[PDB]
């Protein structure tokens, strides 16, 4: 039976070294390639899934108030490079309601949301690196403005700067952060609003864009959304895709937020398996006679490496199937095929345009396709990993005796 061939191969050094080099090729194929890595696509698919979720619903998300979730009389805080209605900014300017659950999002939470969204979109735009890479950096810059009387979301206390008018604050807490504050006076030349306002610039240097760094930002994005859970109000295009519900709380998308949260959890553990593959390098060979019972100490590590690769591939498949729209029903399928896997731009990744709202713009379909393409091209590699798993395991047992 096939176990006759398994032992006949388990004691053939040529047949073992062939599998070991098969494991290096498939290991480097997984964690060093990008186009051709089911693992890569599945991390990318998790990230872009979160990113796209906010692009679809941010423009309709209610937010306002002053500094610590406090109601504001006349505050307008505008965050730039955000998917607003008809705009590349989002405008938090809701007054005389305290922010909270099933109400407007605090400016305190929108800052966490916004910063994670800016770091993601830049990182996506540069291009996520292969999972082997942990030393990639990205520089990130984003601005918001505050206008209206009594708006203190830009004060020296909110931003920490030496002085709101012209000040700057630099942080190096490991990665460098420079915040700078600039007042535009109501009667300044160029001031179109004829109203004083404050522009905050955030410049982040050395921000890591590794799989775990970025998968962690995606978790900050989706989790702030789900925990603040602000009230929302959709504006369906006439003759475009219809959304349901039209009003409610952002948590009300329990199906969608859960899908995204498990996709992030799965890709985090998927990324956690790369360290296993690295620590069980399979490239040294294994002129004399060779008997399994004595000189087969590589078997444990050869099995740990192959099994890591297999779990990484299965997890990759799981990430995709959590969102693959052919397998989805009802509203969740409506959400995904009508909005999340669409881009209403007129469009590199991480591009915010005036028409980005109410569409995912995260190449979600192309990544789902790129994930399938990758897996169908893993046919040989996948069999060889299990074949190497079978050999290494029969040698662990010969080694026990």
């Amino acid at each position: 039976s096939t176990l006759n061939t398994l032992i006949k191969l388990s004691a053939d050094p040529s047949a073992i070294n062939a599998a070991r080099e098969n494991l290096g090729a498939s290991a480097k194929n997984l964690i060093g390639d990008t186009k051709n890595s089911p693992a890569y696509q599945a991390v990318l698919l998790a990230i872009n899934a979160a990113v796209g979720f906010w692009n679809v619903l941010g423009y309709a998300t209610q937010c306002g108030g002053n500094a610590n979730g406090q109601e504001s009389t006349s505050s307008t805080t505008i965050f730039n490079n955000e998917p607003g209605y008809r705009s590349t900014s989002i405008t938090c300017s809701l007054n005389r309601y305290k922010p909270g659950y099933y109400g407007p999002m605090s400016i305190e939470n929108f800052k966490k949301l916004n910063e994670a969204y800016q770091i993601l979109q830049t990182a996506l735009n540069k291009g996520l690196p292969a999972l082997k890479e942990n030393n990639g950096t990205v520089s990130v810059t984003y601005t918001y403005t505050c206008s209206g009387e009594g708006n203190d979301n830009c004060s020296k206390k909110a931003t920490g700067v030496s002085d709101q008018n012209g000040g700057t604050k630099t942080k190096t807490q490991t990665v460098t952060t420079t915040i700078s504050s600039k007042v535009v006076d109501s009667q300044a030349k160029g001031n179109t609003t004829r109203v004083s306002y404050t522009e905050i610039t955030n410049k982040l240097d050395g921000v890591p864009d590794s799989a775990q760094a970025l998968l962690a930002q995606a978790s900050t994005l989706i989790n702030t959304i789900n925990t603040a859970c602000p009230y929302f109000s959709v504006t369906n295009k006439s003759g475009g895709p219809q959304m349901e519900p039209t009003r409610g709380k952002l948590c009300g998308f329990t199906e969608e937020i859960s899908a995204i949260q498990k996709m992030i959890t799965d890709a985090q553990e998927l990324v956690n398996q790369t360290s296993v593959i690295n620590e069980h390098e399979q490239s040294t060979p294994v002129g004399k006679p060779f008997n399994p019972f004595t000189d087969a100490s590589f078997a444990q590590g050869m099995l740990a490496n192959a099994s890591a690769q297999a779990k990484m591939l299965n997890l990759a498949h799981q990430v995709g199937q959590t969102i693959n729209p052919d397998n989805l029903t009802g509203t969740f399928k409506n959400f995904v095929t009508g909005f999340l896997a669409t881009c209403n731009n007129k469009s590199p990744p991480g591009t915010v345009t005036t028409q980005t709202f109410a569409s995912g713009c995260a190449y979600v379909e192309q990544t789902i396709t790129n994930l399938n393409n990758s897996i169908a091209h893993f046919g040989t590699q996948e069999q060889q990993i299990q074949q190497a798993e079978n050999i290494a395991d029969t040698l662990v047992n010969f080694g026990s005796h």
Epitope: N324, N327, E382
Partner: nanobody, 110 residues
């Protein structure tokens, strides 16, 4: 619940189509593929097909077989012509990456 059909004995240079009955549990939205089982050697990958319908094959098979699917009827199809001693095998289908327990197959030898 997975089984094949259409396997049989043919001379070298002949033809026959093989078919895989998979449930949507395996099929809907998943990539499908075909595999070999020769005596004395292991399961070898043959071909694959994307939900969207993209084909690709192995070198031992390059240029001869054609894999196809049916998204209405969860069916996999493989046409084999230009047969060789090397096609003597049990042919099986599975999703990619594989489900743990396999089907029973159908015997094609040349």
């Amino acid at each position: 619940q997975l089984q094949e059909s259409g396997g049989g004995l043919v001379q070298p240079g002949g033809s026959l189509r093989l078919s895989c009955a998979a449930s949507g549990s395996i099929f809907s939205g998943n990539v499908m593929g075909w595999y070999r089982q020769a005596p004395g050697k292991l399961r070898e990958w043959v071909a694959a097909i994307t939900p969207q319908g993209v084909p690709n094959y192995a070198d031992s098979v390059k240029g001869r077989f054609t894999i196809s699917r049916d998204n209405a009827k969860n069916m996999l199809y493989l046409q084999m012509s230009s047969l060789k001693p090397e096609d003597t095998a049990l042919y099986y289908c599975n999703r990619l990456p594989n489900y743990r327990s396999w089907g029973q197959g159908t015997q094609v030898t040349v």
